[PDB]
Design a protein around this ligand. Structure first.
Ligand SMILES: O=C(NO)c1sc2ccccc2c1Cl
Ligand SMILES: O=C(NO)c1sc2ccccc2c1Cl
Ligand SMILES: [K+]
Ligand SMILES: [K+]
Ligand SMILES: [Zn+2]
Length: 396
């Protein structure tokens, strides 16, 4: 039973931003064109009994003043801003990368509604895995919008998971960018282990998840925040070998109750960032599909979320394959996807070849592996977890 977050209103809201435009619609219509929808349990986004209940849910992480500012920003964009209102927005970074637009609050709230409903479906055991392609806004902070992330749906979903009972959550962030917002939220918590693989280089957004020595959490959360910064140009195989032993070692040591995976598609070779060279190939084998298949082999209730990805048809091509892989891994039912894009309302967006495969022809890691292994040992010692060092050592 694989769950997928969707709904008519949800679709309209996810498609209402100037940055992500109709991406979510392309993603969901491609999944539907590949006849995957009948295999999936629709997870309806969470709706609240009152404005107070909605505030209680969002303020489990964000400050009231920030939520008030975001709701006022939407109101203001539904009618220019005064000098005092511009100052107020600037105090929450609601500007530049995170501008206001008529549906800014509804749009960012929708991802939270989706990811909280997805966590609830895992908690009641209705779904083994839940997918939310409208979610994964990893950069949003308590009182600050960042990288087009206004509300952090991941933190709120993880917070719902961790507090459902000892519950431990493993958060794996596959996006090109460092998952700073999620890592910061759980910096002092040993029960949420964060691991982000990403590109890092001077002046590259958001700037964290790299050498500062490496910070890895604080207080009781020391050694609980893991990071693997990778150089530009990394391909499927090298990225797969870089993350594989880390994922496996985290699962053996942490023994998570839940896994939350952020699957931002900006690592694709065809993403306009043009930083990593990952594919959606399923014979080289896509780094994403290798990582997703590995996580699902653990048989731990999992939450799969979206994130980055500016090349909309290529993000759809990758997420359609992630979706089919999840059905296969959970149900044990073969999913056969035709290499040609099937006819549907968005067919023309996949041109000029109309194929499912993206249009692409293809010591530092060992040093990070040793650093990460030491951190995992340190985390295990601080948290009094029983583990076999040799079983973990041999994975690398
Ligand atoms: O509840 C389960 N088995 O009894 C399963 S099967 C499976 C496959 C992938 C991820 C989670 C999961 C769970 Cl939980
Ligand atoms: O895909 C993204 N993060 O995972 C990012 S980073 C960033 C920085 C400025 C503006 C947007 C943006 C997005 Cl989207
Ligand atoms: K990442
Ligand atoms: K942590
Ligand atoms: Zn990104």
């Amino acid at each position: 039973s694989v769950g997928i977050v969707y709904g008519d209103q949800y679709r309209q809201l996810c498609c209402s931003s100037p940055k992500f435009g109709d991406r979510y619609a392309l993603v969901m219509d491609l999944i539907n064109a590949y006849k995957l929808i009948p295999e999936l349990s629709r997870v309806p986004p969470l709706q609240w009994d009152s404005p107070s209940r909605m505030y209680e849910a969002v303020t489990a992480f964000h400050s009231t003043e920030y939520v008030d500012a975001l709701k006022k920003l939407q109101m203001l964009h539904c009618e220019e801003l005064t000098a005092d209102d511009e100052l107020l927005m600037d105090s929450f970074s609601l500007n530049y990368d995170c501008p206001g637009f008529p549906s800014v609050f509804d749009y960012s709230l929708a991802a939270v509604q989706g990811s909280l409903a997805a966590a609830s479906a895992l908690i009641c055991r209705h779904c083994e895995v839940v997918i939310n392609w409208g979610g994964g806004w990893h950069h949003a902070k308590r009182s600050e919008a960042s990288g087009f992330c206004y509300l952090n749906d991941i933190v709120l979903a993880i917070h719902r998971l961790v507090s459902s009972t000892q519950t431990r959550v493993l958060y794996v962030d596959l996006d090109l960018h460092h998952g700073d917002g999620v890592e910061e939220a759980f910096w002092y918590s040993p029960r949420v282990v964060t691991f982000s693989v990403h590109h890092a280089s001077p002046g590259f957004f958001p700037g964290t998840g790299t050498w500062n020595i490496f910070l890895n959490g604080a207080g009781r959360g020391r050694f609980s925040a893991f990071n693997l910064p990778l150089e530009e140009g990394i391909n499927d195989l090298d990225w797969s070998n870089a993350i594989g032993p880390i994922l496996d070692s985290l699962n053996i040591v942490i023994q998570p109750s839940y896994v939350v995976v952020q699957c931002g598609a900006d690592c694709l070779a065809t993403d306009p960032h043009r930083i990593f060279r990952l594919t959606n190939f399923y014979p080289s084998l896509s780094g994403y599909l290798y990582a997703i298949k590995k996580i699902l082999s653990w048989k731990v209730p999992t939450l799969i979320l979206g994130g980055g990805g500016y090349n909309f048809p290529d993000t759809a091509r990758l997420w359609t394959r992630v979706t089919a892989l999840t059905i296969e891994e959970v149900k044990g039912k073969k999913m056969t996807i035709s290499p040609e894009i099937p006819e549907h309302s968005y067919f023309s967006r996949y041109g000029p070849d109309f194929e499912l495969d993206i249009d692409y022809f293809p010591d530092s890691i060992q040093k990070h592996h040793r650093r990460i292994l030491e951190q995992l040992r340190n985390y295990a010692d601080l948290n009094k977890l029983i583990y076999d060092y040799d079983q973990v050592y041999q994975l690398y």
